[PDB]
Amino acid sequence: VRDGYIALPHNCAYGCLNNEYCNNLCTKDGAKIGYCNIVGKYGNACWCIQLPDNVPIRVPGRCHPA
Amino acid sequence: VRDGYIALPHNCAYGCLNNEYCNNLCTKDGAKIGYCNIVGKYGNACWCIQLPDNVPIRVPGRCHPA
């Protein structure tokens, strides 16, 4: 498992206004919990705790939206 | 141990701009890790994970300055 900003395809973060949203999103993807965390995206983005290793997270670099 | 917004008297949270700060603050106080998460209308605050029970966290109610 690992922590990170869960990614939208490809390498794009989920912007957020609410911790509740990130908790829903992260847990549906198998994480323990999620938070709406400062500046993964300009503003805040969802950061998940103990996501399964097979779920992609954001890495430094560009967002290439599918 | 419990998770929460580490508190400054009186029942005030620590505002933040970077995760690094919250991580330092939380871990120096015995928490596992810390994050700078959303805490309302345009503002973020430090959230600590598994903060020991000798360190106060925010509870419902207003922040009373000083």
Swiss-Prot record, chains A, B:
UniProt keywords (A-Z) are:
Disulfide bond, Ion channel impairing toxin, Neurotoxin, Secreted, Toxin, Voltage-gated sodium channel impairing toxin
Could you give a single Gene Ontology term from the biological process aspect?
defense response
Pfam families from the UniProt entry: Toxin_3 (PF00537)
Q: Which GO terms describe its cellular component?
A: extracellular region
Pinpoint the LCN-type CS-alpha/beta domain residues: 2-64
Stored SUPFAM superfamilies = Scorpion toxin-like
Kindly give any further remark recorded in the entry: Exists in two forms, due to cis-trans isomerization at 9-Pro-His-10.
Its biological purpose: Alpha toxins bind voltage-independently at site-3 of sodium channels (Nav) and inhibit the inactivation of the activated channels, thereby blocking neuronal transmission. This toxin is active on both mammals and insects. It can be considered as a cardiotoxin, as it can bind to human cardiac sodium channel and modify its normal properties.
Q: What is known of its domains?
A: Has the structural arrangement of an alpha-helix connected to antiparallel beta-sheets by disulfide bonds (CS-alpha/beta).
Name of the protein this chain belongs to: Alpha-like toxin BmK-M7
Organism of derivation: Olivierus martensii
Organismal lineage: Eukaryota, Metazoa, Ecdysozoa, Arthropoda, Chelicerata
